GROMACS .gro file of C-alpha atoms in nm:
model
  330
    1UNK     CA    1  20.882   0.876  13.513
    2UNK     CA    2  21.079   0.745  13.795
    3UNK     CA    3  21.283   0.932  14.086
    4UNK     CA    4  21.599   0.757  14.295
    5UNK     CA    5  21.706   0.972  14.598
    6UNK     CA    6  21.920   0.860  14.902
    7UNK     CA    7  21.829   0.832  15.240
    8UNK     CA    8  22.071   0.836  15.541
    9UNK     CA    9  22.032   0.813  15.879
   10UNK     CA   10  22.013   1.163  16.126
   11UNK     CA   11  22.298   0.997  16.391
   12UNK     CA   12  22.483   0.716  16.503
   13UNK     CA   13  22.132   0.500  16.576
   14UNK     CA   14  21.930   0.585  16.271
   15UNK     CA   15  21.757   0.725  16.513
   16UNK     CA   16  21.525   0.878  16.162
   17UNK     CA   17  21.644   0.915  15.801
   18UNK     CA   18  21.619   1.216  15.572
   19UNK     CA   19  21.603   1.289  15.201
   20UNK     CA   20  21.680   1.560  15.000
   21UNK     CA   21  21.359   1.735  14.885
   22UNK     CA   22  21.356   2.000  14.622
   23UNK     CA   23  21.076   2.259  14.708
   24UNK     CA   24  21.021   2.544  14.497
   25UNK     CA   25  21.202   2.752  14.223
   26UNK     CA   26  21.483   2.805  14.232
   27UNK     CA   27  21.493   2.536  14.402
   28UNK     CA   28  21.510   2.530  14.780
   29UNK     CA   29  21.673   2.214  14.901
   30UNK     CA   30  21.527   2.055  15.267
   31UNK     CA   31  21.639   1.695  15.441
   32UNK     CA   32  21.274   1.522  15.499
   33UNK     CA   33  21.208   1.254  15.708
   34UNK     CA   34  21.023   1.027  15.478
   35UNK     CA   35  20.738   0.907  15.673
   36UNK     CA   36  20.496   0.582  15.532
   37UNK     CA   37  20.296   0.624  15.883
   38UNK     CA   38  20.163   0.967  15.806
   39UNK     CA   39  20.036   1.185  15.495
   40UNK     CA   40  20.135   1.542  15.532
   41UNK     CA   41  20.458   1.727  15.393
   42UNK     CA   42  20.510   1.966  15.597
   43UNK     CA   43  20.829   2.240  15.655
   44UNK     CA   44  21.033   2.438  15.866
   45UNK     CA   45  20.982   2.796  15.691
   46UNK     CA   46  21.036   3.166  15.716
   47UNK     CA   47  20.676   3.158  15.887
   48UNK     CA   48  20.772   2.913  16.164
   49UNK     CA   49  20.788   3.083  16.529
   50UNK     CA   50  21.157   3.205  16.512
   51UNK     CA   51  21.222   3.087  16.878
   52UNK     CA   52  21.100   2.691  16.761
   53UNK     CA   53  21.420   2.699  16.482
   54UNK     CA   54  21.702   2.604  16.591
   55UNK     CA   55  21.944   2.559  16.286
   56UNK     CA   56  21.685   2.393  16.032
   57UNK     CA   57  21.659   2.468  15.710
   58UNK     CA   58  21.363   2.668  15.582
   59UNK     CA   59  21.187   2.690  15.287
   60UNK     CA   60  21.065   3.063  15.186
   61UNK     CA   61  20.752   3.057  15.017
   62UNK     CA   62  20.856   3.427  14.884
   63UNK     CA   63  21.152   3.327  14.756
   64UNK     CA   64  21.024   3.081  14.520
   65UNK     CA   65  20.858   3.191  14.190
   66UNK     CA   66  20.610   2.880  14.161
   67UNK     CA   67  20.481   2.939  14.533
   68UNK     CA   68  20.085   3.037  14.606
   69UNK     CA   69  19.902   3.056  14.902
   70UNK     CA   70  19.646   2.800  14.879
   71UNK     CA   71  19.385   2.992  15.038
   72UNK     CA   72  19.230   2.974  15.348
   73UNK     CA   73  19.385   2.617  15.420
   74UNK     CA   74  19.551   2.530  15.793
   75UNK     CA   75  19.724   2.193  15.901
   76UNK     CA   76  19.756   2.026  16.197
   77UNK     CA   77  19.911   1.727  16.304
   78UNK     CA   78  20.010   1.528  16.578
   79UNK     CA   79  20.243   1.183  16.585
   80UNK     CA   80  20.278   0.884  16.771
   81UNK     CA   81  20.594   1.035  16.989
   82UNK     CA   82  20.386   1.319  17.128
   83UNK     CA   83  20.492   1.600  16.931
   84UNK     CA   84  20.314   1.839  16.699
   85UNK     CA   85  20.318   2.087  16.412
   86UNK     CA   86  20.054   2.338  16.246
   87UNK     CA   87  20.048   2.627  16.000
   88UNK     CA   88  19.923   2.717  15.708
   89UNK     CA   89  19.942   2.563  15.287
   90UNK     CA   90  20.113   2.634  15.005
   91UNK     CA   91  20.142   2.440  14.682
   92UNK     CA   92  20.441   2.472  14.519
   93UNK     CA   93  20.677   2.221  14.278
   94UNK     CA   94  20.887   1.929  14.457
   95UNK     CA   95  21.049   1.682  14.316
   96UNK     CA   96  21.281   1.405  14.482
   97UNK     CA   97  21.544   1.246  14.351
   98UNK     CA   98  21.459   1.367  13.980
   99UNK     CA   99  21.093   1.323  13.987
  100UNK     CA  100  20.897   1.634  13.980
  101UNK     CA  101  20.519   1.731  14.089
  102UNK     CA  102  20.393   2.035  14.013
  103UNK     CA  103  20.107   2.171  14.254
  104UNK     CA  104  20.173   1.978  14.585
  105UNK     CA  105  20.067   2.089  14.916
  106UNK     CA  106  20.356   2.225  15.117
  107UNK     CA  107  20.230   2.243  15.476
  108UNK     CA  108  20.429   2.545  15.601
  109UNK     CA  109  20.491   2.559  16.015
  110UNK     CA  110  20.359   2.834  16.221
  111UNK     CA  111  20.451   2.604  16.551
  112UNK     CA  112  20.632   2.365  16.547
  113UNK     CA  113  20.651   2.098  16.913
  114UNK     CA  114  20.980   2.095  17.113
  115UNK     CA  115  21.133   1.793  16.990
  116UNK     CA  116  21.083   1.906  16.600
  117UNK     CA  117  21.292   2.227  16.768
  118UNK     CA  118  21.608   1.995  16.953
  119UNK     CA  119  21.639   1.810  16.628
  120UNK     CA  120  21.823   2.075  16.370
  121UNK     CA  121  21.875   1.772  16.116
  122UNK     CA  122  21.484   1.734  15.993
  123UNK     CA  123  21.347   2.016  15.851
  124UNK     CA  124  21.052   1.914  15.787
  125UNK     CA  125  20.828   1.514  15.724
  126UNK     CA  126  20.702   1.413  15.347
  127UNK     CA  127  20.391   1.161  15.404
  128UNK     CA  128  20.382   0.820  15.233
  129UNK     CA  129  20.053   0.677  15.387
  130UNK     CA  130  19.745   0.725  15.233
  131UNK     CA  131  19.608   1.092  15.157
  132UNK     CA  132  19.289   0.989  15.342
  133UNK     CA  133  19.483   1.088  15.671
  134UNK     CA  134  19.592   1.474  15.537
  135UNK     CA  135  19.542   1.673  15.787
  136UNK     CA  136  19.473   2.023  15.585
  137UNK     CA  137  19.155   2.173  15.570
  138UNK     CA  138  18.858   2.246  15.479
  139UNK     CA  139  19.032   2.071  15.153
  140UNK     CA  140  19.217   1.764  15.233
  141UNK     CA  141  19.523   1.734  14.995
  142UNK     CA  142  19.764   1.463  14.830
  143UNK     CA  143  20.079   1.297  14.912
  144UNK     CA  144  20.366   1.319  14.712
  145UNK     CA  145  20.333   1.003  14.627
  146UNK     CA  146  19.936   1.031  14.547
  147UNK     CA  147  20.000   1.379  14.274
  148UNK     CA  148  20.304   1.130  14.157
  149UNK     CA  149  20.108   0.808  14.076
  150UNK     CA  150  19.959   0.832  13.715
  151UNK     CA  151  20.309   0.995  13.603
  152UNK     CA  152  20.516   0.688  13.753
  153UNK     CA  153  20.630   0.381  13.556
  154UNK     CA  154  20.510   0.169  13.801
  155UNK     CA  155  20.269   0.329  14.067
  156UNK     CA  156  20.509   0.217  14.378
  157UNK     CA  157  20.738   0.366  14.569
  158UNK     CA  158  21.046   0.127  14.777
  159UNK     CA  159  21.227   0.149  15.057
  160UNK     CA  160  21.567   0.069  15.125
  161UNK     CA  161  21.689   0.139  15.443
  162UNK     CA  162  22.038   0.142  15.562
  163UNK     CA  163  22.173  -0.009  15.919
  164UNK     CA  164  22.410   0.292  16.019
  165UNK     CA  165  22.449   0.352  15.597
  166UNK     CA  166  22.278   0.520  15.352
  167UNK     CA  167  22.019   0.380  15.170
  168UNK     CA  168  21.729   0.457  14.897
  169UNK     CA  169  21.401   0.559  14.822
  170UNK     CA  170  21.267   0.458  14.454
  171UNK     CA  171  21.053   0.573  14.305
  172UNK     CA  172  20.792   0.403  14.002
  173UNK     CA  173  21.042   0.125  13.951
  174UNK     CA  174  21.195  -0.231  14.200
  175UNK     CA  175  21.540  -0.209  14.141
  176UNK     CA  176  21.591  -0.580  14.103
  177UNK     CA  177  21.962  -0.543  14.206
  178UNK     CA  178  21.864  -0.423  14.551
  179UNK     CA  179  21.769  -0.780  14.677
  180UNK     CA  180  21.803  -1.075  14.702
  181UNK     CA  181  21.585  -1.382  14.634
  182UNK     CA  182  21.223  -1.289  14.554
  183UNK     CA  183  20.970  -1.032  14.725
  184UNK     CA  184  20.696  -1.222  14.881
  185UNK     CA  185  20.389  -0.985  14.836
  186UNK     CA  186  20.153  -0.950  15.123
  187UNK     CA  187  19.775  -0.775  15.117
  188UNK     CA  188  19.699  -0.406  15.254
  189UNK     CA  189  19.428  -0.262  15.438
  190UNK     CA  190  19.396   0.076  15.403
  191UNK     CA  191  19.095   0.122  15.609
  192UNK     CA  192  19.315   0.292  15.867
  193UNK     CA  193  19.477   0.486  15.606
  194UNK     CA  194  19.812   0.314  15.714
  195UNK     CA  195  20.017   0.038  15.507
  196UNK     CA  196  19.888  -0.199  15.712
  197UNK     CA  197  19.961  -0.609  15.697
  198UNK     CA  198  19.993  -0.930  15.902
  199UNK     CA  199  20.281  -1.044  15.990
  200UNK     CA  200  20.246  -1.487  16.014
  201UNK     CA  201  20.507  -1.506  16.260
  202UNK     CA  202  20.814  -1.467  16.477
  203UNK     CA  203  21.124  -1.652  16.606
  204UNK     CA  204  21.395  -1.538  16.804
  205UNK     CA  205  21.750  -1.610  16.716
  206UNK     CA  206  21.771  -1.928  16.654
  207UNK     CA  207  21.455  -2.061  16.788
  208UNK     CA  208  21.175  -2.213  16.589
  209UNK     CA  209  20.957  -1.992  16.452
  210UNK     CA  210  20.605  -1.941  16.608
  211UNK     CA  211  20.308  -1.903  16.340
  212UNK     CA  212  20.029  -1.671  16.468
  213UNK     CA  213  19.871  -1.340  16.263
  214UNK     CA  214  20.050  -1.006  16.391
  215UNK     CA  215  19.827  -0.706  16.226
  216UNK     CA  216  20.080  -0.420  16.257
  217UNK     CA  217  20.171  -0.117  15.966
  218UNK     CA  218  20.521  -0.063  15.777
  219UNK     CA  219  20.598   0.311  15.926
  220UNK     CA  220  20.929   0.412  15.795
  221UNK     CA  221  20.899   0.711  16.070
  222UNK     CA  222  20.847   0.474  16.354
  223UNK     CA  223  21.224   0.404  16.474
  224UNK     CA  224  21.173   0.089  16.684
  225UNK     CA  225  20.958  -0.241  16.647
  226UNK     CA  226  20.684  -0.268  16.807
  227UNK     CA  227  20.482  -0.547  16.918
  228UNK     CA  228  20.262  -0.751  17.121
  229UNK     CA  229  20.352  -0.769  17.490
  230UNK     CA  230  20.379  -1.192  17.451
  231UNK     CA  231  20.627  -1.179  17.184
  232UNK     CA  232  20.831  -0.906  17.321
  233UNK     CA  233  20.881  -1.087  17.653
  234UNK     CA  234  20.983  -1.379  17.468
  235UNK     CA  235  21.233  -1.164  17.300
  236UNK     CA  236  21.420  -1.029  17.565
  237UNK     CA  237  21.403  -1.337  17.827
  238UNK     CA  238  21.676  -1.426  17.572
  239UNK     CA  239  21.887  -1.174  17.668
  240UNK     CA  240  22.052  -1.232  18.034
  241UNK     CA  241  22.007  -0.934  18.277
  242UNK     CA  242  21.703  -0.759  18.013
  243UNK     CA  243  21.385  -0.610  18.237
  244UNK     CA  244  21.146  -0.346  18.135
  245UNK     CA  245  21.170  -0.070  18.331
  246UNK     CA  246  20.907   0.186  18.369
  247UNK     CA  247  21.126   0.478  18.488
  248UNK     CA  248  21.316   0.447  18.128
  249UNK     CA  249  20.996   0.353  17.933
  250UNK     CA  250  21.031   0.011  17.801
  251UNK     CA  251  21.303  -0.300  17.768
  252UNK     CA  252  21.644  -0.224  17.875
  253UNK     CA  253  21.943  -0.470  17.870
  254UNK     CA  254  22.310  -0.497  17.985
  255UNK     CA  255  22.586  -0.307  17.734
  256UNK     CA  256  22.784  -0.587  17.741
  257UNK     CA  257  22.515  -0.868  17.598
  258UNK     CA  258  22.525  -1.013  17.281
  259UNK     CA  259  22.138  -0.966  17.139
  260UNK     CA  260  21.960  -1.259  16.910
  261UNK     CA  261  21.818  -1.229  16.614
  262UNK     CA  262  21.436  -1.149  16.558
  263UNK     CA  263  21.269  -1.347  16.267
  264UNK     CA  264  20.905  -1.195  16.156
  265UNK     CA  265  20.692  -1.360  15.880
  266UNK     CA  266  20.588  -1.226  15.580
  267UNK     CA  267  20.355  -1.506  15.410
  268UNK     CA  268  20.543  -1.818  15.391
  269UNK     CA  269  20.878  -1.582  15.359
  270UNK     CA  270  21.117  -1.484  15.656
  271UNK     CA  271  21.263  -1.179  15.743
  272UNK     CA  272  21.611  -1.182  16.015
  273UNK     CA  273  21.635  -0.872  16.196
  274UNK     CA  274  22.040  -0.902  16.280
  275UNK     CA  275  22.100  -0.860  16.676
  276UNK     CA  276  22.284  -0.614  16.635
  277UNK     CA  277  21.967  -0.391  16.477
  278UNK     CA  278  21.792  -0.423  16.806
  279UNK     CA  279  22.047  -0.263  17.046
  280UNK     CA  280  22.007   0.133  17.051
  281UNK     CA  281  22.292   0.220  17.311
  282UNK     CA  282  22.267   0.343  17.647
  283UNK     CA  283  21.979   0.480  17.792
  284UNK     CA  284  22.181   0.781  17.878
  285UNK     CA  285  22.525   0.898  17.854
  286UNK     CA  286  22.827   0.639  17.977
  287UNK     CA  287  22.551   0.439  18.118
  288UNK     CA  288  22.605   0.017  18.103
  289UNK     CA  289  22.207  -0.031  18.005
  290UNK     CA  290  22.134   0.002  17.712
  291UNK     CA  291  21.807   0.042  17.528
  292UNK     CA  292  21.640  -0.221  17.309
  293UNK     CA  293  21.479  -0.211  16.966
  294UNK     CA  294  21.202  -0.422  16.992
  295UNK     CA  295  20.956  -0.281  17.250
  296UNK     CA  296  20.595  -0.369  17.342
  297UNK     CA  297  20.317  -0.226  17.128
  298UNK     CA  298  20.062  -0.264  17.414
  299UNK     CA  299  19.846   0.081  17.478
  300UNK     CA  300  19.978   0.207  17.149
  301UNK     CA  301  19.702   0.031  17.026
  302UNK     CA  302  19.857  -0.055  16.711
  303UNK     CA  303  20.157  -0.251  16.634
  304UNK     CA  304  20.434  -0.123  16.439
  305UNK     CA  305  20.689  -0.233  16.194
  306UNK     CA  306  20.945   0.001  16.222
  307UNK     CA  307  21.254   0.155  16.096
  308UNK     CA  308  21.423  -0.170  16.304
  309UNK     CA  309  21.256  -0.386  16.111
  310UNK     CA  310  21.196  -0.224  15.745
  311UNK     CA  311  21.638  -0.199  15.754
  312UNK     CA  312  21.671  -0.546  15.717
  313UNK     CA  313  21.431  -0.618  15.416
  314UNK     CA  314  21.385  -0.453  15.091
  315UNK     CA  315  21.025  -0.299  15.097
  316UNK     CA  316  20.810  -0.258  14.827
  317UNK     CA  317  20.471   0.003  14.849
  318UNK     CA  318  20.251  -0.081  14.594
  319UNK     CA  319  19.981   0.156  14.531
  320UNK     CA  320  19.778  -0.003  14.261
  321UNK     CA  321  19.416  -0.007  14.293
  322UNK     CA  322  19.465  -0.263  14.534
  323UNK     CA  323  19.755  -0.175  14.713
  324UNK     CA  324  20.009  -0.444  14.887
  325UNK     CA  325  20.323  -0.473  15.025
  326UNK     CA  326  20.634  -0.657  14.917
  327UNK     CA  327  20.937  -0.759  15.140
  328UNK     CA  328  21.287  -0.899  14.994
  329UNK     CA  329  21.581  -0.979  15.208
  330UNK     CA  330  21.896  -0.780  15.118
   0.00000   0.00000   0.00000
């Protein structure tokens, strides 16, 4: 089997994408966030606090004829960002974008934190790193992705994200029209449960490009690119007027500048990150600084490869027995 669903961008930013996710029967339609940097698929439902919904869609366990309690189970979860979400399992049938799985966890919200509440256009995250990080217990469950494997034609998902567009997420097949050139293939670890790599390298714009080993994981819910201090200050002493300022949390620059491109390494392969990927408006509204896209990874503790950077390639998550990753340019 295969599935093929699009993904587009929550605002003007791509500030997150969502999906279309079919939960349930009849089926109950909810926009995910896809999210390669965590493992749980959880929802806004008729069980979430009714003062934390704020014109999400819900799914209805009740309503849907396949539903059932999976007993005794609880989730809880907390991101990189600071927020939060917890509740209680279900297993019910989803499929996305034509590919179905019967008997998948459905994390249902009891609470959900106050930024899941201020944003009404994600109803709810579907998981894509390994299932060793699934928060439910006592009875740790599956991705998607993980009940969707043997099934597959190929046991890898892609992603394909747009730069303020649309794009897709495949499923069990590369859709060789998607890129172009060849995907350089890169090895996994999967000791942190993440789809994490090393980068070989960086340049900026049009600079020569600097080899050294950047561990970091491909985290399609991550928005920005972040990295090691050294490299980000390189970055944005290219830009005249950019600072990091502590008051607005990170690298800000003038409105008016033109950014250069950022150039990571994937093997002996290169991936350009346009400017224009790395500028994420102003830092508030009619405000002339503007916030950047690359920012520094240091006291995250881990660096991340982004939604900034994952746009401008075509990514491959291959989850054979030894998993790897694959990056094309598009």
């Amino acid at each position: 089997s295969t599935g093929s669903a699009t993904t587009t961008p929550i605002d003007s930013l791509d500030d997150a994408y969502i999906t279309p996710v079919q939960i349930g029967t009849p089926a109950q339609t909810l926009n995910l966030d896809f999210d390669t940097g965590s493992s749980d698929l959880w929802v806004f439902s008729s069980e979430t606090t009714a003062s934390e919904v704020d014109g999400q869609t819900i799914y209805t366990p009740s309503k849907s004829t396949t539903a059932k309690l999976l007993s005794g189970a609880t989730w809880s979860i907390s991101y990189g960002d600071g927020s939060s979400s917890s509740g209680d399992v279900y297993t019910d049938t989803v499929s996305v974008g034509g590919l179905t799985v019967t008997g998948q966890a459905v994390e249902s919200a009891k609470k959900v934190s106050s930024s899941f509440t201020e944003d009404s256009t994600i109803d709810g995250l579907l998981g894509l790193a390994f299932s060793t990080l699934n928060t439910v217990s006592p009875t740790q469950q599956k991705t998607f992705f993980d009940n969707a494997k043997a099934s597959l034609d190929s046991p890898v998902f892609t992603a394909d994200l747009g730069y303020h567009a649309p794009g897709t997420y495949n499923f069990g097949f590369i859709d060789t029209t998607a890129y172009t050139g060849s995907i350089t293939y890169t090895a996994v670890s999967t000791k942190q449960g993440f789809w994490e790599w090393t980068s070989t390298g960086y340049a900026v714009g049009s600079g020569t490009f600097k080899s050294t080993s950047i561990d970091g994981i491909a985290d399609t819910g991550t928005t920005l690119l972040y990295l090691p201090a050294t490299v980000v200050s390189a970055y944005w002493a290219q830009v005249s007027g950019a600072k990091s300022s502590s008051s607005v949390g990170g690298y800000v620059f003038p409105c008016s500048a033109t950014l250069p491109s950022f150039t990571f390494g994937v093997g002996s392969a290169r991936i350009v990150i346009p400017g224009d990927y790395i500028d994420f408006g102003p830092i508030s509204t009619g405000s002339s600084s503007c916030f950047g896209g690359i920012q520094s990874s240091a006291g995250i503790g881990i660096n991340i490869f982004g939604d900034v950077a994952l746009k401008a390639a075509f990514v491959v998550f291959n989850g054979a027995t030894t998993p790897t990753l694959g990056f094309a340019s598009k």
